[PDB]
Design a protein around this ligand. Structure first.
Ligand SMILES: CC1CCN(C(=O)NCCc2ccccc2F)CC1
Ligand SMILES: CC1CCN(C(=O)NCCc2ccccc2F)CC1
Lengths: 193, 193
């Protein structure tokens, strides 16, 4: 039950490593999961719905990791605080490159996928702005841009830059340089006069 | 000749303001341009090719504006230098929101559109890095990140952030705040220790 379901999800994530969702069939997913096509339709209405569930898992995994961090302060300078936070997204999405890639592309064709990204990005921006505000209240960060607007641009930078790196797009920051690149821009823009 | 062609381009840009390219027909474009469908096929192979030509015009317009700037230094602080430069992209693409939007979306489905964006973004990143390097050589900017990697992330930030603003995406920086937001992040990340 949960097992045929997990098998479908696992097969899907595996096949997305070798080709886009458009070139993966329900027959492909049913075969890999060791079920029939009708049985597949019991668990999911479409291959699109399978991707939505995989994305939902990855996004929630990042979100839960960030919550864990937010409850367990690492005893560290402000630079490492931001780095450890950005690193949740670098490792979580970077550990699931095929779902990241397919799920980013599905934003264009799926209202549910677009709304999932939007909902979480809104949450992560709100948390970023809350942390900036705390830094300003403690006198460590200067009162420059509206915190929520700065948070929005930094979050959108990370989305575009991380995913371009993972995809090896031209242009992109090399994956082995992208964390240091983003941390630098976050720290200088949050603390800089 | 060039006139039926310009009419097709103008009709296309006008119709893209009210709906996506998928919901615009060649009949729609031929009618608006006051020609027949066969005559249309003389000027362009597809509605896709029409969008590519419109994008090509917008991208080259931004590029030519930047070249103009690069030959005519405004007598100004470093902050206004970067602002005037970012503003080329804000005004050029923001003056052509429907082509920007459709052309951004076509990256997913058109190798020629993806390669056009890539080619120009590579040029703009190279120029950004050249300016940063000049700032470092004159002793105004510190030698922090590799210039080309910093340039890449700042350019990708601007792409994602400007286009989200123009589209009114959730989340996005309000359009009336996006220039100041980007300039702040550019200046603090380029000059900041
Ligand atoms: C899809 C994208 C992926 C990249 N992304 C991202 O790196 N945000 C960083 C969020 C963050 C870092 C440090 C402290 C708090 C905090 F919220 C947003 C979502
Ligand atoms: C599609 C995107 C749109 C946004 N974008 C962009 O703002 N780049 C800024 C480029 C720049 C600014 C100042 C000086 C030199 C310089 F090159 C890149 C391309």
């Amino acid at each position: 039950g949960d097992d045929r379901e997990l098998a479908i999800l696992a097969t899907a994530e595996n096949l997305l490593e070798d080709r886009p969702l458009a070139d993966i069939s329900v027959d492909d997913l049913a075969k890999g999961a060791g079920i029939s096509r009708p049985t597949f339709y019991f668990y999911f209405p479409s291959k699109e719905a399978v991707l939505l569930t995989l994305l939902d898992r990855v996004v929630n995994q990042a979100d839960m990791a960030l919550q864990t961090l937010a409850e367990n302060p690492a005893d560290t300078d402000r630079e490492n605080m931001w780095r450890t936070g950005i690193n949740v997204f670098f490792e979580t999405f970077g550990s699931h490159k095929a779902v990241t890639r397919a799920g980013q592309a599905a934003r264009a064709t799926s209202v549910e996928v677009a709304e999932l990204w939007s909902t979480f990005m809104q949450k992560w921006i709100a948390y970023t702005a809350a942390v900036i505000d705390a830094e300003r209240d403690r006198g460590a960060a200067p009162r420059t841009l509206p915190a929520h607007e700065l948070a929005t641009a930094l979050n959108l930078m990370n989305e575009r830059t991380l995913f371009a790196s993972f995809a090896g797009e031209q242009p992109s920051v090399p994956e082995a340089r992208v964390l240091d690149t983003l941390v630098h821009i976050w720290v200088t823009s949050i603390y800089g006069e």
